[PDB]
Design a protein around this ligand. Structure first.
Ligand SMILES: *Cc1cc2c(cc1C)nc1c(=O)[nH]c(=O)nc-1n2C[C@H](O)[C@H](O)[C@H](O)COP(=O)(O)OP(=O)(O)OC[C@H]1O[C@@H](n2cnc3c(N)ncnc32)[C@H](O)[C@@H]1O
Ligand SMILES: O=C(O)c1ccco1
Ligand SMILES: O=C(O)c1ccco1
Ligand SMILES: [Cl-]
Length: 385
């Protein structure tokens, strides 16, 4: 018997940030999650996430990255949980052979971002522990870094709840009923109604958006990361080893310096198993490539960070065909907002996306330029049932 102003379905990276933005404004909000965020069944665990500003996926993401960075610094001031460490982010690849490195460089120039350009042995000399061929070049962004993602979600949740937001946990939304003047969700624990709906179900958007009459190609991928015993005199955040995202002939890899001796963390970005979020095997090591694809990179490029595997994690990316996000109103329902398809690179923007989703839910518009995330764009291949 409790109506809400806004209901957020999926209180993860995007939904919890939206919940915080709504609650801060006195908007009566209900967030419903299938688990209890932060958790290890979605796309936000594994402890850390890179935030970059010079953006290799496209210079058009820069304003949102800069606003998100500002919001993360604000969050750091509002909570006792650790939010951000300014490790800097190193991007490298073979000279003239990486579109990712080239666009990162162009984005930095176009937006006057502070970066260092170096190549070959200059890279190996600046950061003991990295061994790249002499024909590699790099761009280092000193002022970007690493986010503690589970801490971010935990902090937004605590702040939102303190302002009155309600979070209904361990409750899966199974269906939606949308009318011109209201929205309704159905769950085994009861049905709830509101004036507006934000849908941010992560990998499950690939299975449940059909309940909103949407047909959009979305593919969930199983993406693992491993933490390795490393030479702390080289790979520790305390000696300024950077976060990194790099392109080599067989793909893109990313990693993090060892924090408090946890070991260097590495992931392989361009390969993952196609999976379903309800049947994915979340145990690290069940496929031999989980660990072998990581050591193939380490033994060649960061040889002193290739010791015993200390910890592994299994997480999911949800890709669109063009690998750009979907942030927009439902084409048939202005009272429904969709946040989907973050394609393995959305966490850094979650603070800014929370702001955008709040604006879309409350006003049907946003001050942010989100045209490239349109649900009606040709490359997405969206349609109705
Ligand atoms: C997995 C991964 C992702 C990743 C990364 C490394 C790995 C291994 N590294 C990144 C990085 O360094 N920098 C960055 O910017 N992004 C990086 N990513 C991607 C990023 O983590 C994802 O893009 C982001 O987390 C996506 O957020 P989203 O909010 O879409 O997904 P979520 O956090 O999983 O939250 C979804 C929530 O919805 C709930 N849910 C699902 N179904 C239901 C139903 N039916 N009812 C209610 N709730 C539902 C989930 O339980 C979850 O909490
Ligand atoms: O394989 C993919 O990456 C995919 C399929 C549909 C959307 O993305
Ligand atoms: O910055 C990103 O988007 C990232 C780093 C590692 C994986 O994704
Ligand atoms: Cl994703």
């Amino acid at each position: 018997s409790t109506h809400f102003d806004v209901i957020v379905v999926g209180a993860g990276s995007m939904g919890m940030a939206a919940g915080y933005q709504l609650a801060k404004q006195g908007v009566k909000t209900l967030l419903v999650d299938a688990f209890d965020p932060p958790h290890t069944n979605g796309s936000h665990h594994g402890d850390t996430r890179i935030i970059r500003h010079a953006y290799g996926e496209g210079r058009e993401y820069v304003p949102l990255a800069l606003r998100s960075q500002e919001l993360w610094y604000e969050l750091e001031k509002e909570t006792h949980h650790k939010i951000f460490t300014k490790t800097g982010v190193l991007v490298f690849g073979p000279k003239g052979e990486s579109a990712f490195v080239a666009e990162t460089m162009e984005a930095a120039k176009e937006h006057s971002l502070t970066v260092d350009l170096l190549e070959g042995d200059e890279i190996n000399k600046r950061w003991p522990g990295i061994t790249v061929p002499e024909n590699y070049n790099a761009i280092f962004e000193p002022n970007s870094g690493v986010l503690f993602s589970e801490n971010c979600i935990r902090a937004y949740r605590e702040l939102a709840e303190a302002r009155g937001a309600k979070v209904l946990t361990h409750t899966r939304v199974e269906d939606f009923d949308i009318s011109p003047d209201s929205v309704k969700i159905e769950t085994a624990n009861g049905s709830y109604t509101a004036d507006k709906l934000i849908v941010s179900m992560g990998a499950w958007n690939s299975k449940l958006l059909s309940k909103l009459n949407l047909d959009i190609p979305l593919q969930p991928y199983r993406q693992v990361v491993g933490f390795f015993e490393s030479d702390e005199s080289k790979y520790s955040n305390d000696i300024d080893f950077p976060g990194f995202m790099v392109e080599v002939p067989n793909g893109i890899y990313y990693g993090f310096p060892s924090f408090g001796g946890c070991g260097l963390k590495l992931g392989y970005h361009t390969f993952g198993q196609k999976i379903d979020p309800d049947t994915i095997n979340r145990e690290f090591g069940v496929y031999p490539e989980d660990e072998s694809n990581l050591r193939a990179f380490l033994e060649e490029y960061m040889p002193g960070a290739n010791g015993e595997l200390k910890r592994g994690a299994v997480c999911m990316y949800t890709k669109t065909l063009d690998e750009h996000f979907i942030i927009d109103l439902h084409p048939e329902h202005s009272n429904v907002v969709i946040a989907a398809g973050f394609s393995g690179h959305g966490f850094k923007f979650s603070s800014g996306v929370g702001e955008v989703l709040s604006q879309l839910a409350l006003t049907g518009k946003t001050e942010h330029d989100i045209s490239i995330f349109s649900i009606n764009r040709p490359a997405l291949k969206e349609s109705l049932q």
